Amino acid sequence: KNVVIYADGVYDMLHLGHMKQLEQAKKLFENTTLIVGVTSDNETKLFKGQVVQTLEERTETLKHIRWVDEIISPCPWVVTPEFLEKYKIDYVAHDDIPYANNQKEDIYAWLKRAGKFKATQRTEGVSTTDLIVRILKNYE
Amino acid sequence: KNVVIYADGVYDMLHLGHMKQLEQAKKLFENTTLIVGVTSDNETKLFKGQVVQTLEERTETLKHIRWVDEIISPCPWVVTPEFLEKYKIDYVAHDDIPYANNQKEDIYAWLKRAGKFKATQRTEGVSTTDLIVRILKNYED
Ligand SMILES: C[N+](C)(C)CCOP(=O)([O-])OP(=O)(O)OC[C@H]1O[C@@H](n2ccc(N)nc2=O)[C@H](O)[C@@H]1O
Ligand SMILES: C[N+](C)(C)CCOP(=O)([O-])OP(=O)(O)OC[C@H]1O[C@@H](n2ccc(N)nc2=O)[C@H](O)[C@@H]1O
């Protein structure tokens, strides 16, 4: 009854949305190991856009989060079944929103069809960027 | 054996500096209870300046940090002997820069004289605002 959970992400400018996500992942079953995958600077730039923080920084911050049991740094961009079998992963946690890879429309779709995906919910309006937006409007 | 450490703060827009301070506090001794105090919205505006996040949001964020054993929200601005009595605190953990208000040049002074203060180190250039400065200095994002 100990279920391995893999949640992957850039985890740039770690903020309460990520932390709450990691909490949902950890708490999907009574007993878990939560493995966090953090993407590389270079893949993140190729496929998404430039990263504010290096992989080292993004990895360091996540060590402070209560829910995290293990970290894979760097992690791959797309989840392969070789990868699930290597880290003994039972389910992959991430939001519902289809995640495009330029021509490939949802890199998580295979996992949903395979029965190996658990949806977590986004939290809105608490990003590191929304916080600065509040500062620039209390000025004004 | 078990030592009770009290770290107090605003803990606005929680960032790696804060987390590292808490980590240091927690690890001051082999066995500890880390109690974190989080200041009220109105006292923070009155004694320090704008607080971006409410008391509820600052409290919630700290819920997620590995080192935190207990939170006192809201906490008082100035530590008193009665407060250390109430929670059984051995040491208050904070950076060693004297912290002024209207009445005293260092609100930590009595604890420092009393052998009841543990200095933690600041970590510079990792704040939530410093991160947003790196986006803006290189708008290539
Ligand atoms: C690169 N991948 C495909 C391997 C995973 C990347 O995933 P991502 O770009 O959604 O990364 P991210 O760092 O933005 O999000 C990481 C995790 O944070 C969660 N998240 C993020 C922001 C937010 N406001 N609420 C959230 O719940 C996302 O749902 C995701 O589950
Ligand atoms: C208001 N008090 C007097 C009740 C508590 C102290 O309030 P404060 O203004 O220092 O709060 P703060 O939130 O700015 O910082 C709280 C704690 O994080 C530490 N800190 C802060 C910023 C930073 N870059 N590194 C840190 O180590 C501070 O030294 C302090 O120990």
Side-chain angles (χ1 to χ4, degrees), chain A residues 2-29 31-101 105-137 139, chain B residues 1-29 31-102 104 106-141:
Chain A
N2 184 260
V3 189
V4 183
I5 299 288
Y6 178 70
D8 59 348
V10 186
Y11 297 112
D12 213 4
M13 302 189 294
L14 198 73
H15 61 60
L16 177 71
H18 304 125
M19 292 169 198
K20 274 156 74 82
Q21 189 262 327
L22 293 169
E23 192 189 15
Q24 293 159 69
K26 165 74 186 184
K27 293 184 170 168
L28 286 164
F29 303 104
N31 294 127
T32 53
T33 306
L34 174 55
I35 301 177
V36 181
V38 189
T39 55
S40 60
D41 284 10
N42 292 340
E43 298 192 323
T44 300
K45 187 170 174 165
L46 186 57
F47 296 131
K48 191 186 191 183
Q50 202 168 288
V51 86
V52 185
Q53 286 175 303
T54 66
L55 173 76
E56 209 181 314
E57 291 167 327
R58 292 185 281 121
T59 304
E60 215 316 82
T61 297
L62 284 162
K63 291 174 188 162
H64 300 272
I65 305 301
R66 184 190 301 294
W67 318 120
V68 174
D69 311 304
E70 300 176 12
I71 295 173
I72 299 181
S73 179
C75 77
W77 206 257
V78 185
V79 172
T80 74
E82 296 70 37
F83 187 93
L84 304 184
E85 115 93 48
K86 180 161 158 211
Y87 299 99
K88 324 309 308 185
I89 290 162
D90 289 79
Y91 305 89
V92 174
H94 190 276
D95 67 47
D96 271 326
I97 318 312
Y99 196 95
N101 204 14
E105 296 312 78
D106 187 11
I107 64 171
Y108 293 113
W110 86 261
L111 295 159
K112 293 157 174 146
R113 296 310 128 241
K116 283 180 197 168
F117 185 93
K118 291 286 167 170
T120 59
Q121 272 61 54
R122 300 184 65 82
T123 309
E124 291 314 340
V126 301
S127 84
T128 306
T129 51
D130 308 313
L131 300 170
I132 297 324
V133 171
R134 296 194 200 174
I135 287 161
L136 300 180
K137 304 198 166 178
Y139 177 91
Chain B
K1 178 53 69 62
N2 195 270
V3 182
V4 178
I5 312 288
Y6 175 69
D8 59 352
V10 187
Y11 298 111
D12 207 14
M13 292 182 303
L14 197 73
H15 60 75
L16 169 73
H18 306 307
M19 301 172 197
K20 269 160 82 92
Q21 190 260 329
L22 294 167
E23 183 189 20
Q24 284 171 69
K26 164 72 185 182
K27 291 179 180 173
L28 278 166
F29 300 89
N31 291 116
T32 65
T33 297
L34 179 62
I35 302 186
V36 180
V38 184
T39 58
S40 81
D41 288 327
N42 73 274
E43 284 166 324
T44 317
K45 185 190 179 174
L46 192 54
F47 303 134
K48 194 183 183 186
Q50 161 174 226
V51 89
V52 174
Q53 286 177 298
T54 67
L55 179 59
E56 171 165 23
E57 297 164 324
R58 294 184 282 113
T59 294
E60 171 68 41
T61 303
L62 284 152
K63 174 199 188 202
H64 301 279
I65 303 312
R66 174 180 301 292
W67 325 114
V68 176
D69 306 309
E70 187 167 346
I71 300 171
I72 294 172
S73 179
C75 72
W77 200 256
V78 177
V79 185
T80 61
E82 312 75 283
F83 184 105
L84 305 184
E85 267 274 53
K86 178 171 188 162
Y87 301 92
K88 304 201 175 173
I89 294 163
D90 299 306
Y91 307 105
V92 171
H94 191 269
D95 66 62
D96 200 41
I97 296 150
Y99 201 106
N101 71 8
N102 303 319
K104 319 190 261 151
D106 186 12
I107 70 198
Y108 292 109
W110 76 267
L111 296 154
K112 275 162 185 182
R113 300 163 183 153
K116 280 168 179 326
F117 186 87
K118 291 272 155 151
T120 56
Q121 317 304 127
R122 297 179 66 83
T123 318
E124 304 290 358
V126 304
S127 72
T128 298
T129 60
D130 303 323
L131 296 183
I132 296 298
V133 168
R134 41 220 256 208
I135 296 177
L136 294 181
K137 275 185 123 92
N138 292 295
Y139 72 92
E140 193 153 35
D141 285 270

